[PDB]
């Protein structure tokens, strides 16, 4: 542990498709026989954990060690050298964490509801610490819309212009935000003095925030930010409730009627074929048009039937992982299949 300290090592994963396929790290001695690989560098290596292996190289000379620390260190290589955009961004579980943390739920526990009659509004909190204590009891939901007095978070450009000077603000200046406690915590992950983002953190929105940080803040700032985002995304993905069961794979209710309709059309086309009116290639062409359309309608009637909080829908629509034609083949229908000839 004495000699290992601060001596960087290079990690490589083949195939090295670009220079970020080799990155330097500081080694922590670990128990066991496996290399532990920070989850945010996977994208760069195209590494998953289904059995991938990686190579370790020890720089010896002062020059090689310095090139490792300076040129090749992982946190100095956050941005893709091909597109100039960041790559060490929250990817799947992290996404579902943050998307769950920053979504606003109408009617959730402890929601702000304005003063009606003799009753006060019962949704306002003197500090985020008070909202934390509320959520310790079963009183406040992390995703419930509330009002909080914020002190250490910069207000939105519009709120800050209204209630202060255009750039006038300080860590002391308090203000009133109608947000969720989750979005308070998210923004507390971002750097001090970044305009408060009151949005559900779809992957695209997180990409926007991190692109802006990389454009306007030093590298180390983006690196510490995405580390904090990682921590929160994992902790909240665990508690997000995204699981799979045969129950959550809802089937489209109109599926029989839709498919019978397009079979009616296909029977018309085949009766038209035997009559001699359609060439064989034209028969297959009309059949493929019909069945593309039926598959599309089945996919639609599926999307119309899924509640927006189903774990399959959530996982796809947050941008965490997957796409919707996968959901359509899972529940719904596979559709048309290719030939050995294509």
């Amino acid at each position: 542990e004495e000699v290992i300290a601060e001596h960087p090592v290079l990690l490589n994963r083949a195939p090295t498709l670009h220079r970020l396929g080799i990155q330097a790290f500081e080694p922590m001695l670990v128990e066991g026989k496996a290399i532990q690989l920070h989850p945010l560098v996977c994208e760069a290596f195209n590494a998953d954990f289904d059995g991938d292996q990686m190579a370790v190289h020890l720089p010896l000379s002062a020059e090689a060690q310095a090139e490792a620390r300076i040129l090749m260190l992982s946190s100095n290589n956050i941005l893709s050298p091909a597109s100039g955009r960041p790559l060490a961004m929250p990817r799947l579980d992290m996404v579902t964490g943050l998307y769950y943390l920053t979504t606003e739920v109408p009617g959730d526990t402890g929601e702000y509801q304005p003063a009606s009659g003799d009753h006060p509004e019962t949704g306002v909190y003197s500090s985020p610490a008070e909202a934390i204590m509320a959520a310790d009891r079963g009183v406040l939901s992390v995703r419930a819309k509330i009002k909080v007095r914020l002190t250490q978070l910069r207000p939105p450009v519009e709120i800050e212009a209204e209630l202060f000077g255009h750039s006038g603000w300080q860590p002391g200046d308090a203000w009133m935000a109608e947000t969720t406690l989750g979005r308070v915590m998210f923004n507390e992950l971002l750097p001090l003095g970044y305009p408060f983002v009151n949005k559900q953190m779809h992957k695209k929105v997180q990409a926007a925030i991190i692109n802006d940080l990389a454009e306007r803040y030093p590298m180390i700032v983006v690196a510490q930010t995405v580390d904090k985002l990682k921590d929160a995304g994992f902790y909240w993905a665990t508690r997000s409730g995204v699981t799979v069961s045969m129950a959550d794979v809802l089937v489209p209710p109109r599926k029989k009627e839709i498919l019978d309709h397009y079979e009616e059309r296909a029977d018309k086309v085949e009766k038209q074929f035997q009559r001699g009116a359609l060439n064989h290639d034209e028969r297959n062409e009309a059949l493929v048009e019909i069945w593309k359309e039926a598959t599309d309608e089945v996919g639609q009637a599926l999307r119309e039937h899924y509640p927006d909080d189903n774990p399959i829908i959530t996982i796809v629509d947050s941008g965490a992982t997957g796409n919707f034609t996968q959901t359509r083949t899972l529940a719904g229908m596979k559709g048309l299949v290719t030939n050995p000839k294509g």
Binding site: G51, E63, I315
Partner: protein, 336 residues
């Protein structure tokens, strides 16, 4: 000179002592001094014993030896042959490969204490945690369906069948109308348990020893976070799944070399764990190193870490003596 049956052996332990005739010119000056002083008239030899390879350990299960003195079929010039058999009891570990039957492979990220695992309402800690994000896009919900059936068979069921047998159970089930705990059932491919029948069994699941139904009619369950104690806020699918230990284990795969054998033709490190080889820093790797502009790392990798036969020794010597690493020489493979 053979290791004794039943010995525990670690890295580098002699398994069979052997010596090879060496020749006086190949004695080191220290070996020559020692042999002269103490009047060792024994033939000069070098140690060519069979040792235990790096990272291997176990119990000597059996020794088998064939001799030329005895009438034993041996290849030409071969005098004595001996096989030591070593047995290791490998536990499951971080880095081992597991998989179900539905292409659902992973390596083990962490083995948690029993108290850290999420556990059911009766204290039963779950055995394995499979990430949700991995299932839907690989199109293998067989693994989920199995899980459901795995739970049912583990708990046992009894369909009502009072006031008639239900509709979902009408088609197939017959003597599958009930099952004792840890029952053994078969889902033949393309003729197995239908979806409705599967959902039906999830209702009539028998309880545990306290009359508690731990898994609801969706296949989900309330789990407590063993780390904090607070319950996880949402019902998690739990059940029983057949998991296999795939023959891709860390013990076989971990490998590291500071320094070792070299190929006689090229003077570059040998290849492969078995030969105590060095990793191949290939062409695309050198492109990566060039694109960084990491010139000295690239040179050092390509001269003193493989090919420079004097710089190798002078570099190990420098590191051992605590001084700066010297300047590379010429790669032997260029002269080749």
């Amino acid at each position: 000179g053979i290791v004794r049956i039943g010995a525990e052996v670690r890295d580098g332990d002699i398994l069979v002592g052997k010596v090879t005739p060496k020749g006086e010119t190949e004695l080191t000056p220290e070996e020559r001094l020692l042999r002269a002083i103490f009047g060792e008239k024994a033939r000069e030899v070098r140690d060519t014993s069979l040792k235990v390879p790096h990272g291997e350990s176990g119990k000597v299960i059996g020794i088998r030896v064939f001799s030329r003195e005895d009438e034993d079929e041996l290849p030409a010039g071969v005098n004595e042959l001996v096989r030591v058999y070593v047995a290791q009891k490998r536990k499951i570990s971080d880095g081992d490969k597991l998989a179900g039957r539905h292409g659902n492979k992973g390596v083990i990220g962490k083995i948690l204490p029993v108290e850290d695992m999420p556990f059911l309402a009766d204290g039963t800690p779950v055995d394995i945690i499979l990430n949700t994000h991995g299932v839907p896009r690989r199109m293998n919900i067989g693994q989920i369906l199995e899980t459901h059936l795995g739970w049912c068979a583990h708990s046992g069921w009894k369909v009502d069948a009072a006031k008639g047998v239900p509709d979902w159970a009408a088609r197939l089930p017959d003597e599958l109308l009930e099952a004792q705990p840890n029952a053994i059932v078969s889902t033949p491919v393309f003729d197995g348990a239908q979806e409705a029948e599967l959902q039906g069994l999830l209702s009539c699941t028998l309880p545990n020893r306290d009359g508690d139904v731990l898994v609801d009619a969706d296949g989900k369950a309330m789990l407590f976070d063993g780390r904090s104690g607070e319950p996880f806020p949402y019902p998690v699918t739990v059940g029983y799944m057949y998991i296999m230990k795939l023959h891709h284990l860390v013990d076989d795969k971990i490998h590291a070399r500071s320094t070792g054998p070299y190929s006689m033709i090229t003077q570059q490190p040998l290849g492969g764990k078995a030969q105590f080889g060095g990793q191949r820093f290939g062409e695309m790797e050198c492109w990566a190193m060039q694109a960084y502009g990491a010139a000295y790392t690239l040179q050092e990798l390509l001269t003193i870490k493989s090919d420079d036969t004097v710089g190798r020794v002078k570099v190990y010597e420098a590191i051992v003596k605590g001084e700066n690493i010297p300047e590379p020489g010429i790669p032997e493979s260029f002269k080749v």
